[PDB]
Structure formats: C-alpha cells, structure tokens
Design a binder for this molecule. Structure first.
Ligand code: T1C
Ligand code: T1C
Ligand code: T1C
Ligand code: MG
Ligand code: MG
Ligand code: MG
Ligand code: MG
Ligand code: MG
Ligand code: MG
Ligand code: MG
Ligand code: MG
Ligand code: MG
Ligand code: MG
Ligand code: MG
Ligand code: MG
Ligand code: MG
Ligand code: MG
Ligand code: MG
Ligand code: MG
Ligand code: MG
Ligand code: MG
Ligand code: MG
Ligand code: MG
Ligand code: MG
Ligand code: MG
Ligand code: MG
Ligand code: MG
Ligand code: MG
Ligand code: MG
Ligand code: MG
Ligand code: MG
Ligand code: MG
Ligand code: MG
Ligand code: MG
Ligand code: MG
Ligand code: MG
Ligand code: MG
Ligand code: MG
Ligand code: MG
Ligand code: MG
Ligand code: MG
Ligand code: MG
Ligand code: MG
Ligand code: MG
Ligand code: MG
Ligand code: MG
Lengths: 76, 63, 51
RNA sequence: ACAUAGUGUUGCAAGGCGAACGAGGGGAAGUGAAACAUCUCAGUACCCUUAGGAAAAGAAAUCAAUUGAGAUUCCCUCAG
RNA sequence: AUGGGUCAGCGACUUAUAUUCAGUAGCGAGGUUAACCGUAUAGGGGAGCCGUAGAGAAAUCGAGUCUUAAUAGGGCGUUUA
RNA sequence: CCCACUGUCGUUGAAAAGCCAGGGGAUGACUUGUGGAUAGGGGUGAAAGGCUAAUCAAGCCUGGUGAUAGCUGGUUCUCCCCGAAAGCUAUUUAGGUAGCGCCUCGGACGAAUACCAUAGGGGGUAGAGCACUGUUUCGGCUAACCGAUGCAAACUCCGAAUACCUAUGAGUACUAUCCGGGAGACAGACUGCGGGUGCUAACGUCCGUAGUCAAGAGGA
RNA sequence: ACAUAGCACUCUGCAAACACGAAAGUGGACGUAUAGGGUGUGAUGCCUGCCCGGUGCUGGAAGGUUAAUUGAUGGGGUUA
RNA sequence: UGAAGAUGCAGUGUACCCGCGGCUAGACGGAAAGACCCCGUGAACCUUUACUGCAGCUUGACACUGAACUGGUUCUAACUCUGUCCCGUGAUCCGGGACGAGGACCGUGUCUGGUGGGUAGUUUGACUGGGGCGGUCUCCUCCUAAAGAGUAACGGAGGAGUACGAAGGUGCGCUCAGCGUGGUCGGAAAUCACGCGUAGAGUAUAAAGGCAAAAGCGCGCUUAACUGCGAGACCCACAAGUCGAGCAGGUACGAAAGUAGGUCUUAGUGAUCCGGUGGUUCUGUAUGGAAGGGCCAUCGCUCAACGGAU
RNA sequence: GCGGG
RNA sequence: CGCAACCA
C-alpha cells in the first residue's frame, strides 16, 4: 500500500470566448486562477479573477503596458 | 386497478401550466456558513428539469 | 472552535443575523450596526445565544 | 336437627353427516420494502364454534353546518 | 464450452383494470354517461368525468398573479380543440 | 446367538451394504419375542449431530403456493427499411439499475449544419534551452562568483505541427435543431500512433486517438 | 472418543431442588441430606503449587443512581 | 494453425473392403447443472459481552385484603394445606362437613424496573491484477493529460474537515529579500547609517496560478461579513456549483470622481425526513378562539462507506 | 439529568 | 468518576 491516490475534480478553466467573437454584456470570457489576463475596456473582473464582458461588442486580446500584460477588451 | 399516486412525490411537485414546480434543496438547517446570495437564490420555486419530467409523470399521473 | 450566535435587532422586530465567534478572544457580547429590513433602517444588533 | 348434596323412575330434547355463502373465537410465513426490525403480506391461509335460506345489520345518545337530512344493507361516484 | 439419440404430438409475452401516446370514427367549445330501469345490444338514466385559466404554501386575486417598501426587476402564465 | 476388526471379491451386485476366509463377545452394563409409551425446534441419545419407516444441522404429507430468484436455460411463420453500445455520472454499486451519450419512428422547421478556402484567436505540448528551481563535470578565484560543459513528468528565457473556437464565402450533401412514442446498451477485443505501469515482458494492464471486429461476406 | 467404579464441588428441609405441562397435574419418590439433582474429573499408587485483578457466584447494605405510582408547584388556552 | 493441446483446418505422409480375439494411449471417454475457489444486498443451522423482541425468573404499586395494641406485636374471619376424621362411597380423584396448622403473609391478576443466546427474527459494505489481509472511500493543488475543455490505474507527490469583528470596508501612506561597507556588547545571521538591489521577500494555511493601482505592509474612521433583486453567462445526467454589470432602499469611507453584497483565488463540507427557537392579519374540521399545520429566518448528523438503506 | 472529585 | 435517560 502506497500513499498516493488522491486528486481533485476538474475546474474547467480557460478561455471561453476567443478573439473576434461577439459577446453580450455579462458573457464570461476567461476563467483563470490568477490574472494571466487583465481586464481592458468594457471588461470586468470577478472575485475569483473571472473576466466578463460588461458591454456588447467583439473580444480583442492585446499585449499592453510596460509590464507586457495580456489584456482582454471588448470593442463596442 | 386504478393507478395510485406516489404520495411522497405528490408533496414535492405541483403542476404548472406547462410542467411542474418544486422547492430547492440545501435550505433546511446549515445556514450560517452560506452566503446571502445562496440563501436568497435558493428560496423560491423552480421548474422540474425536463429529464425528470417523465418519472414525475409516472409517479404523479393525476397532477 | 467558533460558536454560533444570533445578532438580534434592538428594534423590537424579530429580525436577526447569525454568525460565529471565538469565545476566548471575544467574551463580551458583540454589538454591531446592521440593516433591519422590517423597519428598513440601520439599528444595533446585540449578541444572543443560538436557539 | 331441618335441609341440601347425592340416587333412582318416567317424559321430552339433543348428539352425527353434508357444497359454498354468514356470524363469531384464534391467527401465520414465504413475499414487498431491491438488505431489514416499524410497516407490508393480512385479519389473508389455516384451525375452532355455531346458523339460515340467506345470515348479519337495523329504526339515531346519527350525520350536517349558518340550520338542513332522516333505520339498516348493497351498487356507481366522490377519489387514488 | 452448453443443449439435443430419433420421430410424432403437446410446450412460453396472456387476461382484467387504470393510465399515457399514436391511428381511426362520431360529435365538436364542447364531448360522454356510470350504476341502474328496461321483452333489454334500443330507449331512459346528467349523478359524475375530461376540456374550456392561471398565479400563489395559503387566504386571495384572476389574463394575470406571486415576490417586494416598489406600480421597479424577475418567476410562472396569457393565440393554442 | 449377537456383533462387525482385517483382507480378497463383488461395485449396471445374488445384495440400494453382501459373500467367503479369518475376527470379537458369548451369565451379562447380555441377547431376544409379544404388547405398550415418548412426535418435529420435538422425542430419544454409554454423545457419533447419531437415530426418529432405504429420508435428518430440524421427518413426511397436504395447504399458504404459480413463495421469491438483480441468476442459468428456452422463447415457434415470411419479406422490406433503418440500425447501436460495451461510455460518463450515481448507486450496500461493480455480471443489476437510473439520467445523459449512441439507435429508431412520428411531427415541426429547412440550410440554421458539415466538409474546404480565407480571416481572426488563446495556448505551453513535441522540439529546444539553462533565464528560474533542482541536478551535474572540469578549470579559475577565497564558499559565493566567473569561463567552459550536460540533464529534467511534477524546471522554462523560448516554442511548433496538429487540434479547438468564431466570422465570411464557393460547391457538394435531407444536414442541423426542436417537440413526442419505443428501445437496446453501460463484460468489449485487436492493430497503429501518444503515454502511465511492468522487465522500454506478456494474446498483460490502464488511459487518449484512429481503424477494424463486435454487427461484415468476398480477394491476399 | 463415550461410559465406568472411585473422587470433588455445589444445590436441595420436603407442597424439596430439578424436569415435563398452557393449567390441572405428573415424575423426583409412595424416596427424606448415608437422600435426590447439576457440574467436572476418571481404577489404583504418589499427589494436586501460586493468583480473587477480570467474569461468575455467595454474603453485606452505609451511601449514590433509579420504575410504575402520586401529584406540589409554575406556565399556557378558553371567558363572566 | 487455431477460443491458445485437432479424426474433421493448411501442408504433407501413409493407407485395398469387412470381421473376430485382445488392449486401454486419445476421443479434453461415460457417470453426477463442481463439493474446492469466487459471486448473490441466497439459505440453513450454530455461537456470543452484535441488534431487537419474547418465555421464564425476579422487584415494587394496586386488587383479592381484615381487626386491635403500639415499623413491629397480637388476633381471626378472607385465603392456604400434595394434615387427621366423617359423608357422598364400593373411591389415596373431587366435593361438602368437623377439627388441627398456618394467615393477612404466601399465592394469582393488571401495571412496572431488573435479568434474560433459554427461545426468536435478523444484520454483519464495496473497491481489489482471485478472495482474504493490508490500504482506500468526501473535498483542494500539481504531474500523468498527447499546447481549448475532459481523460484511468492498489500511477507519482502533497494538503483539507479551519481561521479572522479584524486578518472585513474605505481613505491616506509605505516597499521588500538579499548583498557590501561602517558601528556598545553584537558574533556568519538582531537593531542603526550609507550604497547597490537582477523579484530571489511576503501572502492565516498545501500547491499552482497571481500580486505595483501591489493582492504584500501600516495608520484614521468604520460595519457593504447589508436587505430586495438581477440582464447575461460558465459548468453541468440530475440534484447541485460558479461569476455577474446594473436597479431600488439603507449605509461606511472619501473634498470628489468613486469604492464596498466579506477575506489574492482555487479546500474548510452533508440532501431529504423528524423535530426545536424567533417572526407572521396564511390556515384554523359547526361558529369564535386555541391546538396543530404552512410561510420567512435559523438550530440539531466523522449520516467520514461523505447521493446519506433502519 | 442526578451525585462525587 | 459513577448511576440513569438516546427514534433528525
Ligand atoms: C521601455 N523600457 C526600456 C522602459 C522604459 C522606461 N522609461 C519610461 O517610460 C520613462 N522614461 C523615459 C521615457 C525612458 C525617458 C522605464 O521607466 C522602464 C522601462 C523598462 C521596464 C522594465 C521593467 C521589468 N518588469 C517589471 C516588467 C523588469 O523586470 C525590470 C528589471 N530590471 O528586471 C525593470 O527594470 C522594470 O521594472 C522597469 O523598471 C522598467 C522601467 O522602469
Ligand atoms: C516590485 N516592483 C515595483 C519591481 C521593482 C523593480 N525594481 C526596483 O525595485 C528598482 N530598484 C531600485 C530600488 C531602484 C534600485 C523590479 O526590478 C521588478 C519589480 C517587479 C517584479 C515583477 C516580476 C513578476 N513576477 C515574477 C512576480 C513578473 O511576472 C514579471 C512580468 N513582466 O511578468 C516581472 O517583470 C518580474 O519578474 C520582475 O522582473 C520584477 C522586477 O524586476
Ligand atoms: C530594459 N529593462 C528591461 C531593464 C533591464 C535591466 N537589466 C537587468 O536587470 C538584467 N539583469 C539580469 C542579469 C538579466 C538578471 C535593467 O537593469 C533595467 C531595465 C530598465 C531600466 C529603466 C530605467 C529608467 N531610465 C529612464 C532611467 C527609469 O527611469 C526607471 C524608472 N523610472 O523606474 C528605471 O527603473 C531604470 O532606471 C532602471 O533601473 C532600469 C534597469 O535597471
Ligand atoms: Mg508574469
Ligand atoms: Mg425554515
Ligand atoms: Mg415478515
Ligand atoms: Mg426484502
Ligand atoms: Mg428484494
Ligand atoms: Mg464442461
Ligand atoms: Mg448431451
Ligand atoms: Mg416435435
Ligand atoms: Mg464371519
Ligand atoms: Mg469366548
Ligand atoms: Mg421440524
Ligand atoms: Mg412439548
Ligand atoms: Mg463434530
Ligand atoms: Mg428450519
Ligand atoms: Mg415456477
Ligand atoms: Mg444500412
Ligand atoms: Mg426526423
Ligand atoms: Mg522533451
Ligand atoms: Mg456497470
Ligand atoms: Mg464497464
Ligand atoms: Mg477500454
Ligand atoms: Mg489485452
Ligand atoms: Mg455481443
Ligand atoms: Mg472479412
Ligand atoms: Mg477473407
Ligand atoms: Mg476425561
Ligand atoms: Mg488417575
Ligand atoms: Mg476389436
Ligand atoms: Mg481391460
Ligand atoms: Mg482408451
Ligand atoms: Mg467427462
Ligand atoms: Mg455449476
Ligand atoms: Mg440466534
Ligand atoms: Mg423474513
Ligand atoms: Mg468484494
Ligand atoms: Mg488540457
Ligand atoms: Mg490536446
Ligand atoms: Mg526582471
Ligand atoms: Mg428517514
Ligand atoms: Mg373551529
Ligand atoms: Mg407556525
Ligand atoms: Mg456508500
Ligand atoms: Mg457514495
């Protein structure tokens, strides 16, 4: 008998809406543990770092700033 | 002879115009640890899922 | 462990909240201002034993 | 002691059998519950006593509900 | 791996009652009687049942109703044979 | 006479327990006749769970009774159309079952669908690398650092092909959805490719992915 | 293996213990502690050590705990 | 070769047709739906300090059941005698009568505590490279996992079953860890000063992913760890779970734009049934009340075999 | 829920 | 420390 048999249930994280797709307000874009993506314009962040669309438009990923951050934003 | 109702299920389901309604679980006795969102969103009635409607129709053939 | 306690409204209404408390690091009865929705107003809720 | 108990004679009656159905006295378990003990099976099988052409029940110390019905029994509903 | 020595005959999805769906027939915002009576498959019997409205735990209201301080939002409903 | 220790034979026997040769007891806690008593969770037992009518860890008969059996077996004429699965989740569940996945029929609605092109996306794998975490060889320096030099599922300064998501478009396909009726199935196998395990064993085992078999004959 | 004579422990005062039986009753026994029941050991010879913590059993009864019963108190409901 | 040990398949060798006496190497020969092994939410018996009943034994209360003198002592008239005598009677049963001995005991009924394998009905998990033994069973993190998601093994590693009224909110402020150089003990490593400083510190807690508008560290004031909700999504067999802008009310902080529906996030959990507590012009079996129920809030499960069979 | 320490 | 009460 060994001491390794455990694991947790899957969490289904990841990008839910890719670049160029249309969203409505409230649509979830990214499920992430930390902020590997940061909220740009028309994108909000939930308590578990979920990125969601706060407006209609199309999704657009970028690399911005001097920290080279990945940003999600919604174009209206 | 006459089909008999499963009386325990007749206390859990009520017929709506196009389906059945039911109360939600997890709202009986362990309530301090639950957030106010879960307290207030588990409160009212909901509709019986369409995958349970067949067994509910076989259990309550008169509602 | 932390014991369950009621915070009862001092407004006459039967409204209360429930929370936990560490009985050793907080022996005094908790008093905190909270919203009573029966009078729609912030009042003081005092600690009481869970029922 | 009186008497009673007991004993005998005469008179009348009963006893036993037989289909189901009735009334009453007792009364399971297999089974189901996907296990099982409450519960179910079921007051069923079976045992016992005893009728009649039927039996039982029956003439409100009953129901109803804004003041109604009018003994009992059985059938359809009410209603799974 | 199993079952059959062979022939002939017999041998296994039924019946009742409810209920749901489909077809078909009648009638149709209506449909239909049950026990029962009945020289009796007729005729009578409308008690009942289903449909025609929903919301709400319920009182209650009703094309709305529930929740709510809210006439806001939301749920379930609203032409529907 | 009662018994039954040994051996052969017999074992569809002469016999559902014997014969034959030997063996034990043979005035006793003996053997035996006739009649009687004890009846089934009971009897009786110098006790072997023995015996109780060739039946005994609870007799036989009848009834309950057509007990129940998620288990075996079996399931009877013809043609035409379509056609699975051996998965997931849960289960005193694992050879059962239920919801979903997969089949079929009816209805509704008809390109919403798919294939390919183009466009737009996010990856952290293969490979690579040593910038971090580890590990590693040599040399210099007074252990840290420096130069050179390797390695990594749980290392990453990097980083494909594919796959996946969305939009637009040509052509070719009764496609895709939705509402109902009926299911079966939830033991899978092998081959290749990517892996865990094993001995970089197994017609081994457990996953992912494609094909075949399952349910598919023909040719090699 | 069982039994066995012998041994020991223990129960039993007689309407005995104990057994059977629903009870009546019957066995024990028309016996009476030198008897009867249960338990173990097993002729005989020599013998049979230590442990009373556990579980039994026997004796004790100071205290705690504790049933039915009883029903003081207190609280509520009704309304003159 | 092949469902893996062939009379029947492939290739090949041999062999005229058919008996009788022998023989037992094969026909996985015949016989008996394997007894061993495992499985079934079979069964039967047996055991016990498994569970739950009951018989029996026992305790007390009330009844049969009374009277005196003081918990007793005495009495007799209920009751008892498997004591003697008489009668029925020709009778070791039984009944009645007389006596004797007991005696309000004993015994029996109803209620009640204890005891109770004597008897009864039952239960006694699954996974598993057979089963047992061991281990495990729910949740979180990483790898396996093949660059979307998902993905198994008794594969490789670790954590959880909490904490906190501030460690929550807000406004304002701050920036580490390590090196060098100096300086009272004091020292490699405490505190002070000065220079660098590559993110290597920290984060209530495991790991991963994050963290400068710091999400890390302080100070002031505070209760948004609010109530009613909620477009729209993610994830999903269901039951559940997750995120959520915005709207109304009432707030806190801020000059203000604003920010707050707990905590950097992902573990810290348990359905239903039964019941408890608070509130409630919902109900209230003729009526008015009430009891009881409903509704809203909340409490009681190592139901840990963690979809929980009693 | 009743006593003891 | 013991005796007694245990039917989400
Ligand atoms: C474009 N780069 C060259 C840049 C420019 C400026 N200057 C400005 O924008 C303002 N002053 C200018 C315009 C030059 C006159 C910059 O100010 C900066 C930087 C670079 C960043 C890099 C940062 C980086 N991380 C935090 C994303 C980092 O890891 C380091 C580092 N040394 O490791 C940095 O130094 C960094 O934090 C940093 O400081 C940067 C700049 O400040
Ligand atoms: C804390 N911030 C203000 C900061 C400051 C400096 N530089 C200084 O402090 C300057 N030093 C002085 C005092 C001027 C001499 C910094 O140099 C840095 C950083 C930030 C870190 C951030 C790192 C980060 N991860 C690894 C925690 C990260 O993922 C990135 C990134 N771009 O994705 C980084 O850049 C980061 O690795 C990094 O390099 C930082 C700095 O270098
Ligand atoms: C270009 N970036 C990526 C960069 C790289 C390095 N290099 C390293 O740290 C290398 N270290 C290794 C060996 C790779 C670990 C760098 O060392 C730096 C920087 C950023 C500069 C920026 C400087 C800047 N100028 C305008 C003076 C500046 O104003 C700031 C600022 N306002 O914050 C800086 O931070 C800056 O002075 C600075 O410190 C930089 C670096 O040191
Ligand atoms: Mg980064
Ligand atoms: Mg509640
Ligand atoms: Mg039963
Ligand atoms: Mg059963
Ligand atoms: Mg069953
Ligand atoms: Mg065989
Ligand atoms: Mg055969
Ligand atoms: Mg035939
Ligand atoms: Mg002889
Ligand atoms: Mg002799
Ligand atoms: Mg028997
Ligand atoms: Mg007997
Ligand atoms: Mg034996
Ligand atoms: Mg039996
Ligand atoms: Mg049969
Ligand atoms: Mg076809
Ligand atoms: Mg179709
Ligand atoms: Mg590689
Ligand atoms: Mg299965
Ligand atoms: Mg399977
Ligand atoms: Mg497979
Ligand atoms: Mg294989
Ligand atoms: Mg098959
Ligand atoms: Mg073929
Ligand atoms: Mg072929
Ligand atoms: Mg002996
Ligand atoms: Mg001896
Ligand atoms: Mg021959
Ligand atoms: Mg022979
Ligand atoms: Mg042979
Ligand atoms: Mg054979
Ligand atoms: Mg067999
Ligand atoms: Mg037993
Ligand atoms: Mg039974
Ligand atoms: Mg098992
Ligand atoms: Mg993946
Ligand atoms: Mg992939
Ligand atoms: Mg850097
Ligand atoms: Mg229950
Ligand atoms: Mg009333
Ligand atoms: Mg109430
Ligand atoms: Mg379980
Ligand atoms: Mg489970």
């Amino acid at each position: 008998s060994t001491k390794n048999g455990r694991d947790s249930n899957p969490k289904m994280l990841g990008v839910k809406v890719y670049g160029g797709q249309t969203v409505t307000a409230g649509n979830i874009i990214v499920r992430q543990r930390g902020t590997e993506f940061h909220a740009g314009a028309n994108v909000g962040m939930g308590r578990d770092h979920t990125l969601f669309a706060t407006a209609d438009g199309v999704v657009k990923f970028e690399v911005k700033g001097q920290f080279g951050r990945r940003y999600v934003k919604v174009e209206t | 002879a006459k089909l008999k109702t499963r009386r325990g299920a007749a206390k859990r389901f009520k017929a709506t115009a196009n389906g059945f309604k039911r109360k939600q679980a997890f709202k009986r006795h362990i309530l301090t640890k639950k957030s106010a969102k879960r307290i207030r969103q588990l409160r009212g009635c909901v509709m019986v899922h369409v995958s349970d409607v067949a067994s509910v129709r076989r259990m309550c053939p008169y509602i | 462990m932390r014991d369950k306690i009621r915070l009862v409204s001092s407004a006459g209404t039967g409204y209360f909240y429930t929370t936990t408390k560490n009985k050793r690091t907080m022996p005094e009865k908790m008093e905190i201002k909270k919203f009573d929705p029966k009078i729609r107003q912030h009042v003081i809720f005092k600690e009481a034993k869970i029922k």
